[PDB]
Every structure is written in C-alpha cells, then in structure tokens.
Amino acid sequence: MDVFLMIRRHKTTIFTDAKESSTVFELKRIVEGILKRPPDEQRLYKDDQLLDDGKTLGECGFTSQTARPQAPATVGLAFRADDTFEALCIEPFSSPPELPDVMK
Amino acid sequence: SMQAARLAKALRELGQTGWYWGSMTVNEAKEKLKEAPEGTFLIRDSSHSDYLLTISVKTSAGPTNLRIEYQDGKFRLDSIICVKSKLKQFDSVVHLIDYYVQMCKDHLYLTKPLYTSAPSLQHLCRLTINKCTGAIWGLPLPTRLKDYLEEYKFQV
Amino acid sequence: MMYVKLISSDGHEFIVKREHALTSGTIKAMNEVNFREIPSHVLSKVCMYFTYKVRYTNSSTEIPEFPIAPEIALELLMAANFLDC
Ligand SMILES: *CC(=O)Nc1cccc(CNC(=O)[C@H](Cc2ccc(OP(=O)(O)O)cc2)NC(=O)Cc2ccc(F)cc2)c1
C-alpha cells in the first residue's frame, strides 16, 4: 500500500512516498538523506499530533486512499533547536488571485 | 463529400481526449467497464464498416454499446437504433460526446470517461477552464494559450 | 541524482524526485531551479502532477481524476505550458 506525502517545514516541502507498513523512523531516514539532519533531531506530525518513531504510517492514519499521488497527505516536520525542538511551523502556500467574473 | 478535412480535425480532437481506445473490441470494452460506476464511458473503433466509432458505457445492467456514424461531414448517433429525425448532428465527435454528457447532468447516460493514460497538465487545465467558461476570448491569457484552448473547447 | 529542488517565486522550496521532475521537458532540458514567475500555490500542484503522471503512465490501474481548483487553473495552464508537461 503506497502512501504519497508532503513533508513540510517552514517553506520546505518534500514530495516523497512510502508504504502504510513504513515506520515513522523510516520516514525520518528519508528526511535525513535529503535535509542532512539525523532522525533524533526530527519530530514528525500528523496535524498537531506527534508521531512515535515505532508506529507505522498506517498506524498513524496515513492510508493509500487518503495519501494519493494527486492529493498527498501532509506530514509536519520540526527540527532540533539547541537543547529542544523548534515549534512546528508550516508556512502556507501563496493565495490565488480572484477569479475572473466569467469563471465564477 | 466525406469532408476529409473536417474528419481529420475531428480525429485530432479525439486523439486529445485521452479516452479514445482505438482498435478495442466490444469484449475488451466490456471487461474494462464491467465494474465501473454507472455512466462511465469510452470511445473506440467500431467493428462495423458502416460506422466510424462506438461508445461503450456502463449501465446498471452491464456495459452497453452505441455506434456513431459519420456521413456528409456530420457525426450522429446510430439511426438504425434511435429515431433519425430527433438525432442532433455534429461537426465534431468530441462535441457529440460533450453534448450528451452535459445533457445528462441537467436512453444514453454518460458521466465520466475512462482514460487510457494520464493527460498532460496543460490539457487538464484546459478541461478545468472549459468547465468554468466558454469565453476564451476574454481570459487574461496570452494569445498563444487562447489558441490552445480553442483547439479543444470541450468539458470532457 | 535522487532529488531536485524547485523554488517558487515566493520562495517555497519543493524537493522532488529527479525522475519525477523530468516529467517536465523544460526541467529536463536544464540541483536547484528557481521559477521567478510561478508562485507556490501553482508550483505545489505541478509537483503533485509529476507524482500522478509517473504513477499513472503505463499502468493497469484505472486513472483517477486530477483535481484542479478553478482559482489556480489559469496560472497552472501557463506554468504547464512553460514547463512542457
Ligand atoms: C439512441 C440510443 O440512446 N440508443 C442506444 C443507447 C444504448 C444502447 C443501445 C442499443 N445497443 C445495442 O443493441 C448494442 C449493439 C452493439 C454491439 C456491439 C457494438 O460494438 P462494435 O460492433 O465494435 O461497434 C456496437 C453496438 N448491444 C450491446 O451493446 C450488447 C452487448 C453488450 C456487451 C457486449 F460485450 C456485447 C454486446 C442503443
């Protein structure tokens, strides 16, 4: 069961995929190879819920039907800051302009 | 005249749909549509030399098929079946399909096409824009992109 | 040669599989790319298109709908044309 994800921190968005049977830790290993911070310096979130390293992505609620290629599920990411973690902070994408009236 | 220049334009449009399956047989279309939602449809070549194309569509009772004829520069649903005088004629076969899809939204029931492959992102945007308006002329787009939209004005 | 970084006009960084980014002939012609005229509400959708296109090319899986909000469709059309995808 493939799950398609956006891992998001600040203004960084990683598009990647994994399996429902993948662990949260394995996701942190993907992030480590991209952003060069080790798993112990990462916190991953589904909405505001901290994810435990040992759980599978399916156990966290990431399912193939709700994490599709054309509509990936978001995983929040926060990094170590000194002796603690930064607060989770994901910056929104830009706002679309107003539709032409002909299109509304 | 068979108006081959018009036919070529219509077949180009058909090639852009992403839901034209070419040489597919009736049996192959049945297997493809067997478990699809009601109204799921595709277009393919017809086995019958008097017709150009066939619509294959899922009904509540299973897939069914309806041929399309091309005569004198016009496409029309099969008139051996449907009463001829009440059949609209079209210059474009994608227009024919789009017309019946839109009529079903407001006994051929068409909803959504079965794609052979993923369309280009440009085409997906074109579909979205067409579902919003037909007034290409006034969109805030460069002329190049208005011409692109004009090449395929259909909502399906 | 595993991921590439695509940066939107408003400074969002999208890190995507290089194989998937090559869906774009324009990206394929050119590790990081800056799109001075494509904002993040457009570029994020482009990146989902890459995932969808790779997944649903030469598959036996039924091809699902690719969702595009009317409000992004015009800029996304221009992006897709510029990107040749
Ligand atoms: C005006 C209107 O709405 N007419 C209309 C709509 C829906 C259905 C029909 C009647 N259709 C049939 O009787 C078809 C005839 C048919 C059979 C096979 C093809 O494919 P081709 O030879 O490759 O062009 C075209 C038309 N009968 C069926 O579809 C029955 C059927 C179903 C599944 C199969 F695998 C085989 C046959 C009129």
Author numbering:
A (entry chain B): 1 to 104
B (entry chain A): 30 to 135, 149 to 198
C (entry chain C): 16 to 45, 58 to 112
Sentences from the paper on this structure:
A co-crystal structure of SBC2 preincubated with MN551 for 2 h prior to crystallization revealed the formation of a covalent bond between the chloroacetamide group of MN551 and Cys111. The binding mode for the remaining portion of the MN551 molecule remained unchanged compared to the parental analogs. Time-dependent reaction monitored by mass spectrometry showed that MN551 covalently modified recombinant SOCS2 protein to stoichiometric occupancy within 2 h at Cys111. In the presence of MN551, GHR was no longer able to bind to SBC2, nor to compete out the inhibitor, demonstrating covalent saturation of the SOCS2 binding site by MN551. Covalent modification of the reactive Cys111 residue by MN551 was confirmed by co-crystal structures, and intact ESI-MS spectra with recombinant protein and mutants.
The Src homology 2 (SH2) domain recognizes phosphotyrosine (pY) post translational modifications in partner proteins to trigger downstream signaling. In this work, we describe the structure-guided design, using fragment-based growing, of a pY-based covalent small-molecule binder targeting the SOCS2-SH2 domain.
